[PDB]
Write a protein that binds this ligand. Structure first.
Ligand SMILES: CCCCOc1ccc([C@@H](C)NCCCNCCC(c2ccccc2)c2ccccc2)cc1OCCCC
Ligand SMILES: CCCCOc1ccc([C@@H](C)NCCCNCCC(c2ccccc2)c2ccccc2)cc1OCCCC
Ligand SMILES: [Ca+2]
Ligand SMILES: [Ca+2]
Ligand SMILES: [Ca+2]
Ligand SMILES: [Ca+2]
Length: 145
């Protein structure tokens, strides 16, 4: 089988966040920008290593099909939480355990992706379960898969 229309719509939007020029391919330069936007600072060598890991046709760049392949499977029951754990840590700017509407809005922004109040209000509402108005690690994990 395959992902739904909306599912596709979500993978493409996250792909466009790496593809700054919008030409359809992710370069090491475009990946670096994203890393720097996250406070991190990798080297050309490391950047190319990250790309080579998913470059199925080995042309030095990543495309949507290449991007989706790596997405549609953590191919690991172990070490998948080690990524979700870091993802959550990226958003929880104050390691308080709870992700707020402001931390989410703050991060999404640094990634050249300005949201709307209504958009930000829906991403949180949908993930919030305990009704505290914030997304804890628990809620975060389930929202992923
Ligand atoms: C999220 C959480 C986990 C994943 C899994 C499927 N990626 C496994 C490969 C780990 N190394 C490369 C990750 C790297 C990366 C992603 C795509 C292309 C090159 C590098 C990256 C950059 C920015 C934000 C997150 C990740 C993707 C996304
Ligand atoms: C990051 C790119 C999309 C992948 O992450 C996923 C994002 C949303 C889902 C679905 C099933 N859950 C939520 C439905 C869509 N509502 C928007 C959620 C929103 C979001 C939710 C909670 C907190 C902050 C944001 C969002 C948007 C874009 C990227 C990440 C998160 C599954 C994912 O898993 C698919 C990965 C392959 C197994
Ligand atoms: Ca590009
Ligand atoms: Ca490629
Ligand atoms: Ca927080
Ligand atoms: Ca909550």
């Amino acid at each position: 089988d395959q992902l739904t229309e909306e599912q596709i719509a979500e993978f493409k939007e996250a792909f466009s966040l790496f593809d700054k020029d919008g030409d359809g391919t992710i370069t090491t330069k475009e990946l670096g920008t994203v890393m720097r936007s996250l406070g991190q600072n990798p080297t050309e060598a490391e950047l190319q290593d990250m790309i080579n890991e998913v470059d199925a046709d080995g042309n030095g760049t990543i495309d949507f099909p290449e991007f989706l392949t790596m997405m549609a499977r953590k191919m690991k029951d172990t070490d998948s939480e080690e990524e979700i754990r870091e993802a959550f840590r990226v958003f929880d700017k104050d390691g308080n355990g709870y992700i707020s509407a402001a931390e989410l809005r703050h991060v999404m922004t640094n990634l050249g992706e300005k949201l709307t109040d209504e958009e930000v209000d829906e991403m949180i509402r949908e993930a919030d379960i305990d009704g505290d108005g914030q997304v804890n690690y628990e809620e975060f994990v389930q929202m992923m898969t």
